């Protein structure tokens, strides 16, 4: 039934996004404080419209439109929570006794994943039983992650005021890109003529790429480029609490809203559940109001 998958998906995404509120003492995105407030305002508006879509379409049995409203609500709830968690962090770190950290040049988790993915795709291009189709699928993985590595290198170069590091991040990226370009030549040859000799030539051309990946990993792992965690004071933690509590309350009511709506979509002849739905919806709105008020009060700058 249309709407049922959306409700289940929404409840899963809510369960995932609520984890951001458990200990929001490190930055989770690049938004400024007013960036967070802008996002809270925009997502609140979208959510308001979506809650009306949920009720009205469930009431009248417009199931595809119901599913769309559920999906829109879910997206807005996630956007809202990301903004709230970031805002909470910014409030916490703004306390005089809190110690601001510093942003690392390259985000470490996706960096490691990119390197690992390239290494495994290169290994695939090396398997004796690799089908011709698998050459092309491996190539897509190489294409994705080598381009991502180069992008990260340019970002890191922009971020650092060390002229030597600026130049080296660009050079390392060039090595990844040029070794990949050489590999691409051999991939083209192997795809055009699927011979054992061309398989060997492709395998061979993975080596300079693996070396480029390893060399960049070694360079980028310099402790001087690493992130330094924020230290949030107890006062900072107390200051961010009203934002966190309101965001948590909002998600609790939103979960109840979606669960109630899921039932009403199936059977809208249920006056008690309509009241429950209106209660959850108003409590979502109340929680958002309280969060906005708290954000205006606890603003660092």
């Amino acid at each position: 039934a249309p709407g049922q998958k959306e409700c289940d998906n929404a409840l899963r995404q809510l369960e995932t996004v609520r984890e951001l509120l458990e200990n929001p003492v490190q930055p989770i995105n690049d938004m400024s404080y007013f960036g967070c407030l802008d996002s809270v305002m925009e997502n609140s508006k979208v959510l308001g419209e979506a809650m009306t879509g949920i009720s009205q379409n469930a009431k009248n049995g417009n199931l595809p439109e119901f599913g769309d409203a559920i999906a829109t609500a879910s997206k807005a709830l996630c956007g809202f929570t990301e903004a709230a968690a970031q805002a909470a962090y910014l409030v916490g770190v703004s306390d005089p006794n809190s110690q601001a950290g510093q942003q690392g040049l390259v985000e470490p988790t996706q960096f490691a994943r990119a390197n690992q993915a390239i290494q495994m795709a290169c290994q695939s291009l090396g398997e004796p039983g690799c089908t011709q189709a698998q050459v092309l699928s491996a190539a897509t993985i190489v294409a994705k992650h080598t381009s991502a590595l180069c992008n990260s290198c340019r970002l890191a170069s922009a971020r650092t005021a060390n002229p030597t590091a600026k130049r080296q991040f660009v050079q390392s990226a060039k090595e990844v890109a040029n070794s990949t370009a050489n590999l691409v030549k051999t991939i083209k040859a192997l795809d055009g003529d699927f011979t054992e000799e061309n398989r060997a030539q492709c395998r061979a051309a993975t080596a300079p790429l693996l070396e480029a990946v390893d060399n960049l990993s070694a360079f980028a792992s310099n402790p001087e480029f690493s992130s330094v965690p924020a230290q949030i004071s107890p006062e900072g933690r107390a200051a961010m609490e009203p934002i966190v509590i309101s965001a948590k309350t909002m998600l609790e009511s939103a979960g109840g809203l979606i669960q109630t709506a899921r039932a009403l979509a199936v059977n809208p002849r249920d006056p008690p559940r309509w009241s429950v739905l209106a209660g959850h919806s108003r409590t979502v709105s109340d929680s958002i109001k309280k969060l906005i008020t708290s954000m205006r009060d606890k603003a660092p700058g």
Partner: peptide, 21 residues
């Protein structure tokens, strides 16, 4: 191979930027 070239279009864009340095 134009299809394989297309697969690496994002990398080509990165190379275009890196070449400027």
């Amino acid at each position: 191979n134009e299809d394989i070239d297309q697969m690496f279009s994002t990398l080509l864009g990165e190379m275009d930027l890196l070449t400027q340095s």
